[PDB]
Symmetry: D2
Subunit: 494 residues, 4 copies
Amino acid sequence: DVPAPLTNLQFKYTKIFINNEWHSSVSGKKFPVFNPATEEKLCEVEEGDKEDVDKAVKAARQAFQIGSPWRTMDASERGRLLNKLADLIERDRLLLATMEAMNGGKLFSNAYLMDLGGCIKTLRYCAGWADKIQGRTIPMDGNFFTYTRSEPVGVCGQIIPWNFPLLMFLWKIGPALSCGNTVVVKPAEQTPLTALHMGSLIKEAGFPPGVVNIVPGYGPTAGAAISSHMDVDKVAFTGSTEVGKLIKEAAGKSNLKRVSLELGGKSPCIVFADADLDNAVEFAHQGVFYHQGQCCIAASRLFVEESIYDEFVRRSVERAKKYVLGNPLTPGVSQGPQIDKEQYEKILDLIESGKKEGAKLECGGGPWGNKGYFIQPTVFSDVTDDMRIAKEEIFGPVQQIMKFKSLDDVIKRANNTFYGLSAGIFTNDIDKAITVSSALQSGTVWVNCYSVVSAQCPFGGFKMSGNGRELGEYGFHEYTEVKTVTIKISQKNS
Amino acid sequence: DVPAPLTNLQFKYTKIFINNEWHSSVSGKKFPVFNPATEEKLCEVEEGDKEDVDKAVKAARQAFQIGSPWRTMDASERGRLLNKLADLIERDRLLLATMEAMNGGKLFSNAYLMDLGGCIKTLRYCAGWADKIQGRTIPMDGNFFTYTRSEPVGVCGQIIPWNFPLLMFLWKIGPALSCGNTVVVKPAEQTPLTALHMGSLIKEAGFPPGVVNIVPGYGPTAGAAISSHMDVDKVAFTGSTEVGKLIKEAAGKSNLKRVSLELGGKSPCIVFADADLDNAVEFAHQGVFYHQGQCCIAASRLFVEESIYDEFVRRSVERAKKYVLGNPLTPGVSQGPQIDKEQYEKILDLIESGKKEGAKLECGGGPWGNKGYFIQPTVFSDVTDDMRIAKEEIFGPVQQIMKFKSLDDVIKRANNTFYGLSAGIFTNDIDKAITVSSALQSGTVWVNCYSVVSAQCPFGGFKMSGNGRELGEYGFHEYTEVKTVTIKISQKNS
Amino acid sequence: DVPAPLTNLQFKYTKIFINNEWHSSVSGKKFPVFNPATEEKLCEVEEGDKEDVDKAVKAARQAFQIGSPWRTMDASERGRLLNKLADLIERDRLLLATMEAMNGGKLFSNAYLMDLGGCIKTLRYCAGWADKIQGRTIPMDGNFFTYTRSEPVGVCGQIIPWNFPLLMFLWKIGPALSCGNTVVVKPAEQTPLTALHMGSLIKEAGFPPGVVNIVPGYGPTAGAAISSHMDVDKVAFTGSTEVGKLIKEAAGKSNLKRVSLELGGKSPCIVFADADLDNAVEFAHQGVFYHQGQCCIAASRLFVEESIYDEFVRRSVERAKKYVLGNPLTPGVSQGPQIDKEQYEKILDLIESGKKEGAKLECGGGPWGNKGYFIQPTVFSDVTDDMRIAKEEIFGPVQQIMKFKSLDDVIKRANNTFYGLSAGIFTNDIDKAITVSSALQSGTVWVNCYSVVSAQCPFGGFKMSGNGRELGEYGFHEYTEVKTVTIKISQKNS
Amino acid sequence: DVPAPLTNLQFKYTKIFINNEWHSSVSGKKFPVFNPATEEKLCEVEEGDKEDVDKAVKAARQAFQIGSPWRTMDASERGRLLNKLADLIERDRLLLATMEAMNGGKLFSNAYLMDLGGCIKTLRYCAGWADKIQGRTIPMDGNFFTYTRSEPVGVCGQIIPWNFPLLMFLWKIGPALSCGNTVVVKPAEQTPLTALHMGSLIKEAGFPPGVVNIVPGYGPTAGAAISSHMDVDKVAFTGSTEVGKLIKEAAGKSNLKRVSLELGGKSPCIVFADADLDNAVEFAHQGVFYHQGQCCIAASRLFVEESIYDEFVRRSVERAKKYVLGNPLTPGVSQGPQIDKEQYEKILDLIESGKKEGAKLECGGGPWGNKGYFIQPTVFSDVTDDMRIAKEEIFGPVQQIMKFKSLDDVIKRANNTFYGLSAGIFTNDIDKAITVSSALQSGTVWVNCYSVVSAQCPFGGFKMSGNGRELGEYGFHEYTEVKTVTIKISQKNS
Ligand SMILES: NC(=O)C1CC=CN([C@@H]2O[C@H](COP(=O)(O)OP(=O)(O)OC[C@H]3O[C@@H](n4cnc5c(N)ncnc54)[C@H](O)[C@@H]3O)[C@@H](O)[C@H]2O)C1
Ligand SMILES: [Mg+2]
Ligand SMILES: [Mg+2]
Ligand SMILES: [Mg+2]
Ligand SMILES: [Mg+2]
């Protein structure tokens, strides 16, 4: 069941979280946080900047010192702590989901069922890895005993976006902590509030001070202080390709910190004429429209084989007209607002470009309401590869439908992008399913489905969609630093 | 046995290698290659620059296309080809070792036994991995069949230094090819010649054209074209920390290419009073003086416990006086020249700083001879942490000896550097061996030995000594890109 | 803190557990269960035999059918269930520990702290593996896509002993269930009661009917019905070497079921003259005397280097005189009874053989009290290799101390047994620690400690001490059956 | 190209091979070895029995001692030796293929291309694993450093059949030697000769004496001495299910040696109405008729969906009539003899049972020729589940074709056997491919192909088709024994 959301939320956690204590910003500045459905201020939060980040990094470094409680505790106890944290998220699920919906413009039933469910599941999966991260014993040449230690990397700076604020917060801290790292988290300026609530739960669960620090504030201030910091070992970032470039450059200029990036996409969804059409229409539809289009994996180039194209367009348009826009806390609302004015204007501008460049506007194409950042769900057909709406990540409720005839051509077109996050293929042909998935330059390839993301699966981009993977076995190994130890012995035996 | 070296070598491979053919530079320019022991010109080599790199990257890209011979080939056949390459190195061992000694200022016996032995071993280890790089099947939530592919990354730019030219060439191409990548290699301008001879063996072994391309030339021209190229998927670099910063920055500013770096060090070697002194003196001595000090892992901060410090200094000084400097092809010579004038002047300047800053000059401390870049083997004692010779990588035959009293202090001092490549510990105490090795922020930690490097071990730096690991199981996972494929099914079963 | 135990326990779960329901035996027979400290009857339990086992195996088979709730549920949900079961064990910890102490003759504080703690920890570790058991994707020759599935093996018969009844019950069901198997458990006739209580918790936690079935009763009846059953896929057994032989033969004669055995030992503990003696005395002492000697790993051959032998004997004898025998529920009692009359007589007979064969009786050597199976802690010195007490597993509070002079000789003597479960080495010498541990033919080798067993470590025997490993990563892989699936495709790419 | 076979082979290796020397049998007895196509004696070979096995096991044990050349050798050197062995097989390919064809009744082109090709590939794959078999470092609870060693198991007895004599020899020794074991091999009495030639190549390649020992002779004499030996650590066996039962029983009764078995099959091949029929007919046909039906994986229950059954039968019968029987060295012959009289009579008897039990004889059904054990290729249709030819492994050129209507029923029928080695599915449906392959209780499941076996894949049976897997990563883990070493330390850090 989905309970009724709370209303009249009273805010409590508005400060910078360092060493399990709440701090005012060093400057004393605060910044306002808004509800994108109503444009009203929810509260004000302490504005972290470089001086706040430096305090947080000193805390994280101290907590990582050899002999500290976090370095010496059993790996199994790191697991127990993560599970305790998941129990507290379950206890606080209704508050968190309400908060996430209010601050994120996110449909409440989705926040409650999907986001919060994924948050719990992600932590449970992470908890289970803690005492199963292992090194090796290695049959090296000569009279030596050699082993490796899978150590934590150290102090990990973690910068996250506004589209799945709580889920992304846990995607970052879960694996990092499971592996024994300490962290400095920088939530999006738009969406700090669930992250700050999580500070109280981290303390309550019993994590040692300085293992998680949380610095709300802006990007080129707090975020950039993290990327350039000379005592941050690793930075992990989810957001725009443009900012990912700045982060990698900053890492280079400063201390060569390790870098992982998940960056967004222009993911192709390929529907062959032999596909189950009912299934493909719905998955491709949800695949681009989910959370008002504000998903890195959005199926924002829908390639449909010529013989089924007109029918696929007709059904896709029909499907896009079935939404009720409004406050995402209101029962019956099936589409909320975009996050803020910047994203709103970016989308409208891209919609305008589609009209100007000759795409066929099938429905929507304009704003809705007299408050909040609402945009009518929009479908364009007869989209061609050179159009802005075919090239640029829109991050709004805007679907592009394109035709193809040749298998070789559609693979080429699908791969002809600097992005590489995900892709979908719809076919009943075994050979196409395997060979087309092998040929697509995308990190995750769905076959006869879309948007299926689990904690057990590694997730991340090819090309400019990202560096590294998150979650799964592979993700974890990347919050470790490998040390080889080679001991001379009188005589080795096999 | 070590055969007599060749003399009066006739050079043959002096051109840019692309698509298994030999090309003049686009500009027509050539650059001279010298013998550092004699200062005489060995030959001229085509000067590759940006336009040559662009041809090479186009060739590597074409060779990496889906359906190409290199992509479709059995993994086991990639392994066979690598072993065939090692057989050809075996056949050409005397030529390659002679050429390496002449061009690199490297003691011929060492080039023949160690460098070329390591080249062969590295390739044999790589060849064995080719058909053992596997993905996973994953028991993800819901009715899906999910698996991963460990795909090659793609086109890999590989930039290498002058100290172990051939060995570094094969450390790069071996793992990359084992995993199915295609490569563009940029040898150091000082030492292109053994790499160019390898082009002929790569063609002879039967690698498809475009799988290995080799562009000799300079750093800020050919190297920088690779690091900034918009169609190179990954850059791997071994060299100076200064250039590694440029490489990472260039990767960020361009196409977000994956980056691995191995960058040199200021490696501490810690000798406790309970150590076997005979063993420790020799390992520490070789650990800093090997190849005229031109090793990334040089034991360039030797920390010796107070009660044994004077005796260790005395023994280390005695040991450093047993060298015959000269041409490294000449029987009886046990120390060759530094690679070139830049390095020579850098070393002399650091020696001068030691004298100025109050270190105790125990022996050497000046140049030798009237041709070639020779420096007397030099030992400083009473070295303190703030001295230039205690902080900066010297890369010359210059040993620093420092005293300590406290275990906690020597760990702190050992770790108090931006570097983290390697370290050594000498002790008879089991507890110190394990706990001190855990506490040291170094990628490889040797216990009662030093300089022990084998293809089976991962190798690389903590902190600003590097990103990523090379060789071993962990290294090979670095030349792959993980794809997750998730297929909808009617019902899953365990 | 250790709470006071319960007294006046009222028994509830006395029946055969099949399909989450409680059954009377098919014959109607019951068997008595006793307290070994008092010889009083605790209760009667339904006596399972072949006809009961057949019902249980049919239940387990049905629960394992393709499409069943247990085969289709998410692997992550198997994990959640195991953790829920651990939560219930925590809730019921005082009852279970009291029961275990009363039925097992086991010191209550140990039952509460060690056994029950290990039970919880084992389940938490198992839970975390459930959705991390993965297969492979394999770069096979030719145009094929090949993967493997790590399936459960199926119906697993699990026969367990009386010395750690609850812990062994969870060692068996934890990994089996984590991997997706169904099970038929046969607790020791001496000690069914905690296992039956666990049936109620299994039901309460929500495991589907037939996933765990529990058949109390005797060995050659219920146990042998399991080992010979034509529809049991795998049998796992912990107990005597003699019975392990019967189980493996039965598996051969019947349906070739998979077999794993942990079988007991005659584990050597080697103390070199360079060891920390205080540490070695206590670990070797606890290593043989723990739980009245009733541990598979008992350090029942203590080899002490000649120069420290007399002192080690003196201190070991002194240590063995510090026990208070009695009811293991009574505060202050530090040694409980042996499990039953058979074991009691076996021990006394072996003690008698040590006296007859010329070992030096240092202390104990006889029974104590006028009810319950109590034996004075006994130390023999001047033990030689041919003596019964040096060869045969005693499984009582009887320590054998033996001298050695030569390193080569002591390794030979240590290895000169058909057993191979565990061993200990006490030394301050790094080289001995590594090389002696490599040379000993034992499954687990402790260095400067003994009896250290964790869920993260694989555990089992060399030679006649066992087949396979339990727990750790390696243990789990053995509750799986590997299926290779190879699909023809038009063209493979790397 | 296939060269002409040799004729008039002169035999040289006819003795028992122990410690790299050739021994007469202890008894002095010899046994004759025949050509099954001509019934003529090729040569006589020393008849090994229990006393010969005992000499061989003593040699293998000595070679496995700590400090021996085989135990102390670098793992990478074991790999080099294996590759050298494969080089010698390459050199001796024509001799070995000719000898295999003559002794084994095997088509010469197949022996030269397939058997010998597979022999070489297997060894090359094995050689690559040698220095990549690794243990773990484990983050166990408490202040300990814990690691594991993946040790060899020890002395491995290896008993092999007559159908793929050389290939099975190398399937056994390759993985065992790669992992560092020593072996005692017992070739089938029908086919010792290629194995004895391998002894000469093992010595030539440079394997230390006692690492491979080879004892020709009979089963209940030499084989049973191995299975019951008190100093063989592991037995690996390929052959009849009946003998595998004896082997497992003997292991239980003696020393609890580890056991792996591959035992033959009654493998179902399921053709759905939506399959590519041309493809399915040929794969199913080869899948049962290959090597005169003498393959463990024979597709000996062909289930064809009702609507296509008559056409499939017609096409299968047409296909079975295209053979020329005769001497397998003769160009143009496409079917050779069965191995010996026992097999010949067993096949004829099963053919007779098919006729008696009402199966429809479509073609063949009787003997051919006046010398050698030839049977006409035989096809039965309208075969039902209860018939002897539907249940028992025939191991002759006899194809059974059965109809089905329901998916659920054909899975149930396919699984309704004690066997479980392999299966095939032919369909164009993605869902059926994945779900039906998940549901089939078979070790290898082929989709749209059959008989595809590669060194990179694990291979073995479910149920009474086997215990354990051979080859692939999983197989190699089967020739190791895991040791856990746990060292006390002052304080652990992550
Ligand atoms: N590929 C496959 O799986 C198959 C291959 C061959 C037949 N397969 C099946 O088995 C049947 C009989 O063939 P046989 O020839 O009798 O096999 P055996 O199993 O006897 O012979 C196999 C090996 O075991 C040795 N041996 C025999 N008796 C022994 C004993 N008591 N202790 C120890 N060892 C004994 C024997 O010397 C030979 O070395 C065939 O019709 C096939 O159905 C399947
Ligand atoms: Mg921005
Ligand atoms: Mg430079
Ligand atoms: Mg018994
Ligand atoms: Mg037989």
